[PDB]
Amino acid sequence: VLTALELSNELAKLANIEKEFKNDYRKLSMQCKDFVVGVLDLCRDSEEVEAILNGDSLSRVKLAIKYEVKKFVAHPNCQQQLLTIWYENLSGLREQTIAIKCLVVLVVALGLPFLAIGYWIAPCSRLGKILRSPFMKFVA
Amino acid sequence: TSLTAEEERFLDAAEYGNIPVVRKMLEESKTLNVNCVDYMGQNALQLAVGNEHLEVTELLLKKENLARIGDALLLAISKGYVRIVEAILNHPGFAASKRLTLSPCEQELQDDDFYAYDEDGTRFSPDITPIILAAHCQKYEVVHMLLMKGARIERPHDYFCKCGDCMEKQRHDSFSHSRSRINAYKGLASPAYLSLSSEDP
Ligand SMILES: [Zn+2]
Structure with a gap:
C-alpha cells in the first residue's frame, strides 16, 4: 500500500x-489510488483497519492526504477510525444533534x-482529558 | 509440500470428480486421512464442493470425523449448489448442534476448524451465518431450506442499546460490530429473506 501511494x-x-x-x-495514478482503496476495502476487523491506516499516529492517512488520495481517506473504513479518534474521551456527544453541539460551543x-x-x-x-480531546480543541 | 502420493491422488480425484477412485480410496485404507489439507490448499471436501459433485461430497460425508464442513456449506451457499447444501445439512453435526443457527464467532469455543478457511481466516466475515449469506446471494431455494431447519437472521439490537452483549462488542473492535450490523441488515433487506421470512412481507 505504501509502494502504491508513493507510485501514485x-x-x-x-x-x-x-x-x-x-x-x-x-490514469496510472488513478489505478494506484484504486488499488489502495480496494486494499482498504477488504477490512473486516479494527486491527486490519489500523494496520492499513499506519505501519509498524495515522501515518498512512497523513501520507494519503499529502498525495491527494481522496477516496482512501473518505472511505468509511477510515472515517470510522477518524470519528472514534475525533470524539475521543467524549463519546456521548457524537450521537447528539447539531443543536446540542452548538449549545456545547x-x-x-x-x-x-x-x-x-x-x-x-x-x-x-478528570475534565482535563475532555478538554484535551481532538474535538474540544476544535470547539475551543 | 508436505503432502504424500496417496493423499495427493485422493485430492486430485476428488477435485476432478473421479468417483470410483475416491470410493476405492475410502475403502479399506488405513492411510489417506480424509481431512488432510495442504499448507496453503483446500480440504478434499472443499475441493469436491467447489466443483459440483454430489456423489463425491456425500461419499466424503460418510465419514464421521471430518472438518471444514461449515466452510464448504458457506461455499455452496455462495453458489447455486442447492443439492450440495441439502446433502451437507443432512450431516448429523448440524442436526445435533447449534452450529447452523448461531454465528461462527459466538457459536462455541470454536476449538474445531468447522468454519475455518485455508490457514487462519474464514471464507467470509466471522459474523456471517449461513442464512445471512444465503440472503446475501438471494438464493430463494437455499434461504427456504435454511429457514425450514430453524435458522433465522437474528434482528440486530438498537444502535443505542446498552446491554452487556452490545457493550462487550462495542468495547473492543467496534468496526467489526458495525460491519456485522450492516451485514445482518443486508441479509434482512434482501428480497429473498423478505419474501420467505414471515407472513405479510
Ligand atoms: Zn444489546
Missing part, C-alpha cells in the same frame, strides 16, 4: 511534468476563561 505520487508528478502524455500518467464560549484558568489542574483532573 510519482505518476502525478510525472503527469504534471510531461504535459504530453498527461492522460496516461493520470456556546457553553464553552461563555466559560472559556474559567476552563482556561482551571487548565492548570486539568492534567490531574
Whole structure:
C-alpha cells in the first residue's frame, strides 16, 4: 500500500511534468489510488483497519492526504477510525444533534476563561482529558 | 509440500470428480486421512464442493470425523449448489448442534476448524451465518431450506442499546460490530429473506 501511494505520487508528478502524455500518467495514478482503496476495502476487523491506516499516529492517512488520495481517506473504513479518534474521551456527544453541539460551543464560549484558568489542574483532573480531546480543541 | 502420493491422488480425484477412485480410496485404507489439507490448499471436501459433485461430497460425508464442513456449506451457499447444501445439512453435526443457527464467532469455543478457511481466516466475515449469506446471494431455494431447519437472521439490537452483549462488542473492535450490523441488515433487506421470512412481507 505504501509502494502504491508513493507510485501514485510519482505518476502525478510525472503527469504534471510531461504535459504530453498527461492522460496516461493520470490514469496510472488513478489505478494506484484504486488499488489502495480496494486494499482498504477488504477490512473486516479494527486491527486490519489500523494496520492499513499506519505501519509498524495515522501515518498512512497523513501520507494519503499529502498525495491527494481522496477516496482512501473518505472511505468509511477510515472515517470510522477518524470519528472514534475525533470524539475521543467524549463519546456521548457524537450521537447528539447539531443543536446540542452548538449549545456545547456556546457553553464553552461563555466559560472559556474559567476552563482556561482551571487548565492548570486539568492534567490531574478528570475534565482535563475532555478538554484535551481532538474535538474540544476544535470547539475551543 | 508436505503432502504424500496417496493423499495427493485422493485430492486430485476428488477435485476432478473421479468417483470410483475416491470410493476405492475410502475403502479399506488405513492411510489417506480424509481431512488432510495442504499448507496453503483446500480440504478434499472443499475441493469436491467447489466443483459440483454430489456423489463425491456425500461419499466424503460418510465419514464421521471430518472438518471444514461449515466452510464448504458457506461455499455452496455462495453458489447455486442447492443439492450440495441439502446433502451437507443432512450431516448429523448440524442436526445435533447449534452450529447452523448461531454465528461462527459466538457459536462455541470454536476449538474445531468447522468454519475455518485455508490457514487462519474464514471464507467470509466471522459474523456471517449461513442464512445471512444465503440472503446475501438471494438464493430463494437455499434461504427456504435454511429457514425450514430453524435458522433465522437474528434482528440486530438498537444502535443505542446498552446491554452487556452490545457493550462487550462495542468495547473492543467496534468496526467489526458495525460491519456485522450492516451485514445482518443486508441479509434482512434482501428480497429473498423478505419474501420467505414471515407472513405479510
Ligand atoms: Zn444489546
